[PDB]
Amino acid sequence: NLLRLGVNKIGDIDSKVSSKASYLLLKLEQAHPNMKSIVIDAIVDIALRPNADYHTTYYSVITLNQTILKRSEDSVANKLVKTYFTLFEKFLIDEKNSKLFSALLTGINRAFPFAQIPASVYEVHMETLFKITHSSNFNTSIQALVLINQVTVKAKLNS
RNA sequence: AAAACUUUCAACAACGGGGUUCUCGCAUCGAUGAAGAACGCAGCGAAAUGCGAUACGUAAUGUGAAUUGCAGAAUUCCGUGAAUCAUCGAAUUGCGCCCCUUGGUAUUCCAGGGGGCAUGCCUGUUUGAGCGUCAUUU
């Protein structure tokens, strides 16, 4: 219940409260790595809500991006990559969008190592990633190119 | 896997916020449609032409079966009558009458062509009518 309240305050109206909640959640993960999966699940529980609101999901994606991953946490990384892709399809389906895509690409790049997902999953979004590379915000195109390079290398596409 | 987050600048992007009345001066009117307005007008039209809210028009006169891209009226058609018809002096498309001349089986009926005729009033010419009055054996 305490975690529910704390992660609920990610979607607060005031950006200061959301930032404080994100910082405290990241501190909580560091203090107790074992609850990292529970914290990530709780954050996912809000970001995917039908009434999530752009502020809440944006700060939640930031918090998920700033999580730390180890080479034995494939389940957590496999959770995070799928969550990022689901959110990406949710919002793709502009300036506010560009920042959220930047953060989502950052998260997918962070979690693409440590993630044992079939390459075919990324192949579905590959064209979409290229659509980002010519986007208005170059900060998104950098991360899109990073993701494209990583997927191409691991999947051994023609490149 | 070096970025995020807060704050302040800075851009860039959203979001955002003719009438009516009063006063002043000037003096110039036309039955031939002024100045000004505007739907653009035709049953359905763009230009051309025509017109003015009576708006491809209204009235009057003439002609006589159309208009036409489509639709639709019809003209009781043997005529009081269409026509984006004509003339034009001011849908009423109102209400009419008769004469002259030729033909088609022609005494009936029909078809052409031409010509007048609205009414009222004044003057004068002509023609008649009245049991109105009257003369009428040089």
Side-chain angles (χ1 to χ4, degrees), chain A residues 19-128:
Chain A
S19 287
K20 186 63 175 184
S22 187
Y23 162 82
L24 291 168
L25 287 162
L26 284 158
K27 192 181 170 180
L28 182 67
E29 280 189 8
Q30 287 167 0
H32 296 286
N34 59 3
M35 312 180 321
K36 185 189 296 171
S37 178
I38 306 176
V39 171
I40 286 163
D41 289 332
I43 295 159
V44 171
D45 198 0
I46 313 179
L48 287 176
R49 288 181 189 173
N51 292 318
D53 204 59
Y54 170 85
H55 180 94
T56 311
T57 183
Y58 167 61
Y59 274 84
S60 292
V61 169
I62 286 163
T63 316
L64 292 171
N65 291 356
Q66 283 166 340
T67 61
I68 301 162
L69 297 170
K70 197 257 179 190
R71 287 173 191 156
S72 54
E73 294 175 335
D74 300 292
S75 59
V76 181
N78 286 337
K79 277 183 184 176
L80 287 168
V81 172
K82 290 168 196 148
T83 301
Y84 294 139
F85 278 123
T86 48
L87 287 164
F88 184 65
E89 283 187 348
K90 186 187 192 196
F91 277 96
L92 189 144
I93 289 165
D94 280 337
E95 271 179 15
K96 65 178 72 66
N97 288 335
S98 82
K99 182 70 171 174
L100 189 58
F101 293 143
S102 176
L104 288 165
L105 286 165
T106 311
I108 295 161
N109 280 325
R110 191 143 157 158
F112 179 85
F114 309 103
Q116 297 181 24
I117 304 188
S120 54
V121 178
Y122 305 98
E123 285 165 44
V124 170
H125 318 286
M126 181 71 39
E127 300 206 311
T128 303

